[model samples]
Target: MNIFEMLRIDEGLRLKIYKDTEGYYTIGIGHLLTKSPSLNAAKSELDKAIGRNTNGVITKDEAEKLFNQDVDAAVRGILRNAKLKPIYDSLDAVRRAALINMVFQMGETGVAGFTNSLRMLQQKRWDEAAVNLAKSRWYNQTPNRAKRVITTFRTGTWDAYKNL
Candidate 1:
């Protein structure tokens, strides 16, 4: 199993903070709070998991290290879609990266939810898929990011955002 899948099964996905049996304030996959050496460290790691500086918390180098290590598992998630597999497999590097990004954003289930979009992509209908992507609710939630993905989809070029 992929690291992400393993972690997901072992840690179980948590959308909110809860006390583990051992009484650690925890959230996300399995980020522990009480175990941290310091308050700032715990907050920083929490901030990384939630994607913002909650309470001036930043750093989180360790947390990011752990999270990034599971990125390969996103590909494992992507490969679960048989219908999308051939299309995904045929994509050029940039497009493949775009697909991976999409999978990371929504998981294979969400990617599979885009039936028409995947069909259009499978049929080599770039313009249709791009338009469909732009029109998605996911796009409306994050216009700049969605536009970047759409641009990559349409042009097959990696769109570097401001940060790494």
Candidate 2:
């Protein structure tokens, strides 16, 4: 029903370390230990999460902590981004969740690169926004996920998720 629930389904609740599609070291609800703000910070958090056990497992609570941290950071980045702020504000709750979901995966900087798509989103051109989203390497990278997100944006409804 919420972003975390959707992410839990999309990202999965990985307690042990594993590699993501790009082969980056990841764990705990999509927490990448490589490029999340900084490698040192990420490692520290991972260590803290497992209490320096080094066995590479974390509890559900620990996973939620990391998930919340990343989500909160992404939300702040989106809220403070001058270019994205207005568009984010203008959206309804469902559309806003789509925006946040995009930011969550792509990061604020990566999403900011979509000038035309963001423009179309700002202008409320849902079809154009979905079109722009479909024509990207990000879409090619994880098409199932991107397709659902695109449909969510295109329709401003959770119907896209029913199929997921």
Candidate 3:
């Protein structure tokens, strides 16, 4: 899917352990190893997802496979949002994928906090929605990724990645 290219470049493949910019224990294309109830439990889930005892490392194949699953989970999670479902349907794939990208990092709940942005998007106020996104902490933290998403919302066109 078109979303894959944007995500792959932004997340970056890592066969070895590394922390995210905000310092979460993650690996394999931004896959969160600390998203579980406990660090040990997170590793348990990681092993389950990667289909092995990773011992803190992953292969390219494993990372790619995990990326697909994460994207699916993000999309499904968004659709379950009653308010967003209609807005999601109203958007074209490019814009929809932008939200998916944000959700992959922020979780559906976090994006839902973008009440003003979502309202503008729902009302078909394109640039207004984009402006609101740019004002966010997400934008502050990941400027390049956020800029691309904001441009997509503002122009209804995918922008080339600026930086990782």
Candidate 4:
């Protein structure tokens, strides 16, 4: 089974499943929206899957587990198919993980649709990349959530925004 399969959208158990693993926000949820902490849990699981790490480090065995042995291989499939890796490699740890988390949350097809930002990252034009990221439909869709991550990716500063 793939991670997506494990985390598939199930109306019945969404709340129960998500509560166990919520991490951090990637986009802020507006007061108008009925926010659930589940979004954060889903993001967290995706982040761990993306980073392929138990702690802050990615080890060979972790790589084997996440990619080769993760129950759902969604994480492995993403890394295998990404064109953004080289750029991702250049980002600071926090920023890199944040972006990977974003992609995992949205899927590569969704996140990679940001062609302009992808281009900027490829060129190592970080400020431009930040601006491009903000212009995306994803930017403020969740309130201040994506903004915080974009800020970290743009500036390489950790904890630019406090955890909820």
lDDT of 2 at 134: 93
lDDT of 4 by residue, 1-164 (tens): 22222122211122122222223322211001113455544445544554632222333443334433422333444466566565566666666656655665566677667777877876768788888888766665543657766776677664544432
* lDDT tens digits by residue: candidate 1, 113-157: 888887777777888889987878888876766776777778775
> Candidate 1 — worst ten consecutive residues by lDDT sum?
1-10
The TM-score values for the models, in the order shown, are 0.60, 0.89, 0.89, 0.52
Question: Which scores better on lDDT, 1 or 3?
Answer: 3
Best by TM-score: 3
Per-residue lDDT over 36-143 for candidate 3, one digit per residue giving the tens place of the 0 to 100 score: 445567677678878889777788988888888899999998999876677789888888988888889898899878888988998889877888888989999999
Give lDDT for model 4.
0.49
Q: Assess candidate 3 and give its lDDT.
A: 0.82
* Candidate 3: 10-residue stretch with minimal lDDT: 155-164
Residue 139 displacement in candidate 1 (angstroms): 0.9
The 10 consecutive residues of candidate 2 with the worst lDDT sum are 34-43
Better of 1 and 2 by lDDT: 2
Candidate order (TM-score): 3, 2, 1, 4
Give the clashing pairs for model 3: none
Residue 3 in candidate 4, Cα distance off native in Å: 17
Put down candidate 2 lDDT per residue, 1-164, tens digits, no spaces.
Answer: 56777777678878877777777767888877775545455567678756775556778888888899988988899999987888898888888888888888878988888889989998999998899889999999999889888988899888877755
| Cα lDDT listed for each candidate | 0.64, 0.82, 0.82, 0.49
